[PDB]
Amino acid sequence: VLDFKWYTRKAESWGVQTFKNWKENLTISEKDIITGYTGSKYDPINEYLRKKALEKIENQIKNLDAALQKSKITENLIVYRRVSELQFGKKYEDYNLRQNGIINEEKVMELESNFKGQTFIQHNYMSTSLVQDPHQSYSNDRYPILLEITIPEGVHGAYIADMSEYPGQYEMLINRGYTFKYDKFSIVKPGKEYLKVNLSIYL
C-alpha cells in the first residue's frame, strides 16, 4: 500500500507522473469542469438534487463522470480526508465530538458502536488528499475527524492538484458512487486531538 504520509514532494511527483497521460487526454470541457469543481461553492450531485442552471449541473456531472471513468489508480493507496461530524449524518451537526481540543471518549465509543462495520454510499464526488493535512482549508483546527482511506488498485480517481484552484490540497479526486466501510476508530493525541477513522472501499 502506497502511503505518502507528509511527503509532499514525493506525492506531487507521483501524482503528476502517474496521471500525466490521463490529463493530456482530457477534453477542454473535462479540464474546465475539474478545475471549476475544485473552486465551487456546491457539490454538483448535492446541488443537482437541491435544485440553464440545471443544464450547467447535468453537464458538470457528465464531464466529471467521463473524466474520472477514464482514470484508474495504479497502486493500492492511502488517501486522507478531513470531515466534521456531519460525516455521520445531518443530526450529528451538534454532536460535540471535540471540546477545547479534546476528543470525548464516550462519543468515540458511541460512533464506534453505531458505525464500526457498517457502510455508507459516498454519493458526491470524493475529494481527498494524497498527504495528510496539507492545507489550512481542511485542517485539524477545524475538523475533528481524519478519514484514512484505503483504496484498491483500479478505482476510478485521479490526481488533479496542478489543475486545481487550490493545488496545495494535493487532491486525489475519487469518483462518485462508491461505498465505503467504517473499519476502525482511534483517538490521536498531539495541537488538538482528533478521531482517526479508517475506511476501505466496498466494491
- Binding site per annotation, positions for NAD(+): 38-50, 81-84, 122-124, 138, 171
98 binds, among ligand P34, Cl ion, none (CB under 5 to 8 A by kind): Cl ion
Binding-site positions:
38-50, 81-84, 122-124, 138, 171
81 touching Cl ion, by CB under 5 A: no
127 catalytic residue (yes or no): yes
88 touching ligand P34, by CB under 6 A: no
Nine cell digits for residue 43: 457539490
Q: What SS3 class is residue 123? A: coil
Q: How many residues bind ligand P34 (CB under 6 A)?
A: 9
CA distance 131 to 80: 7
Contacts of 129 (CB under 8 A, 6+ apart): 79, 80, 81, 135, 138, 169, 170, 171, 172
Q: Are 174 and 43 in contact (CB under 8 A)?
A: no
Question: Looking at beta carbons only, is 26 or 147 nearer to ligand P34?
Answer: 147
- Out of 23, 82, 98, 176, which residue is the one contacting Cl ion (CB under 5 A)? 98
Question: Which residue among the candidates 12, 30, 80, 81 is catalytic per the annotation?
Answer: 81
171 catalytic residue (yes or no): yes
Buried/exposed code over 114-141 (b: 16+ C-beta within 10 A; e: otherwise): ebeeeebebeebbbbbbbbbbeeebebe
Binding site for ligand P34 (CB under 6 A): 81-83, 127-129, 138, 169, 171
